[PDB]
C-alpha cells in the first residue's frame, strides 16, 4: 500500500495545482480519484479541497443557468418566441451538466463519504454537503423532480441538524449548516417563515454565547454570523 500513500499525495498536489490554474472540473476529478480509492476518512485538507472543487465546478454552471433563464424570460415577455425557445434549449444543455456534476458528488457522498464519517464534525460536514447538492438540483428542477430532490435535501439537512446538536452553537460547521438550511427553506421550499425562524434562531443562539467564541474560530464564525444577519435583513424587508 506504499504505492497508495504516494498516489494520494500526488492527486492532492494536482488538485491544488488545478485550483491555482483555475481548472476546477479537473480539480474535482483529482479529488474524486482520492475519494474512490480510499480505506474505511479524508483529512480536513482533502475534504475541503473536495468541496471547493465541486463548489466551483457547479458554481460556474449555476451562474450561467441564471443568466440564460433571465434572457429566456425577457424574451417570453417580449413575445419573441423563437429566441426564447433557443435560450430554452441552451438552458437545458447547462442543466444536463449540473445534473451530472451533482450526481457525481452525491454518489460519492452516499456510497463513500457519509458511511465512513466518525467525528460529529465530519458527519455534519458531509450531510450538509449532501443537502447542498440536492438543493442545487432543486434549483432548476420542476414539478415532481423538484419535490423528490427537495425531499432528499430536507432529509440530509435534518440529519445534519441532529448531529450538529453536539457542536457548540458557535461552531463554524453548525453555523454554516443553519445558513444553507435556511437558504434552502427560503429559496427551494418557498417557506420564508421557517427560513427566518431558522436563521434568527441560529444567530441568537450564537450571540447568547459570544463569550465562548474560541480564538481559533471567531473569524469564520463571525463571518457566518454576519451572512446570517445579511440574509435576515433581506428576508425581513
Amino acid at each position: 500500500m506504499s504505492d497508495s500513500v504516494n498516489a494520494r499525495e500526488s492527486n492532492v498536489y494536482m488538485a491544488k495545482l488545478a485550483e491555482q490554474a483555475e481548472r476546477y472540473d479537473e480539480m474535482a476529478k483529482y479529488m474524486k480519484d482520492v475519494v474512490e480509492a480510499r480505506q474505511e476518512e479524508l483529512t480536513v485538507e482533502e475534504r475541503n479541497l473536495l468541496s471547493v472543487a465541486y463548489k466551483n465546478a457547479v458554481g460556474s454552471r449555476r451562474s450561467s443557468w441564471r443568466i440564460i433563464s433571465s434572457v429566456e424570460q425577457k424574451e417570453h415577455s417580449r413575445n419573441a418566441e423563437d429566441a426564447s425557445k433557443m435560450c430554452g434549449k441552451y438552458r437545458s444543455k447547462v442543466e444536463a451538466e449540473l445534473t451530472d456534476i451533482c450526481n457525481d458528488i452525491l454518489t460519492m457522498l452516499d456510497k463513500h463519504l457519509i458511511p465512513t464519517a466518525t467525528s460529529p464534525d465530519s458527519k455534519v460536514f458531509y450531510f450538509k454537503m449532501k443537502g447542498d447538492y440536492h438543493r442545487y438540483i432543486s434549483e432548476f428542477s420542476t414539478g415532481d423532480s423538484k419535490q423528490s430532490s427537495a425531499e432528499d435535501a430536507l432529509k440530509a439537512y435534518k440529519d445534519a441538524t441532529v448531529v450538529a446538536k453536539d457542536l457548540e452553537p458557535t461552531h463554524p460547521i453548525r453555523l454554516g449548516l443553519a445558513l444553507n438550511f435556511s437558504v434552502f427553506h427560503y429559496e427551494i421550499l418557498n417557506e420564508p417563515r421557517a427560513a427566518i425562524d431558522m436563521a434568527k434562531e441560529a444567530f441568537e443562539m450564537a450571540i447568547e454565547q459570544l463569550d465562548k467564541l474560541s480564538e481559533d474560530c471567531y473569524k469564520d464564525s463571525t463571518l457566518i454570523m454576519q451572512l446570517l444577519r445579511d440574509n435576515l435583513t433581506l428576508w425581513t424587508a
Binding site: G176, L179, N180, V183, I224, D230, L234
Partner: peptide, 6 residues
C-alpha cells in the same frame, strides 16, 4: 439573492 456559505 440570499448568500449561502462561501
Amino acid at each position: 439573492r440570499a448568500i449561502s456559505l462561501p
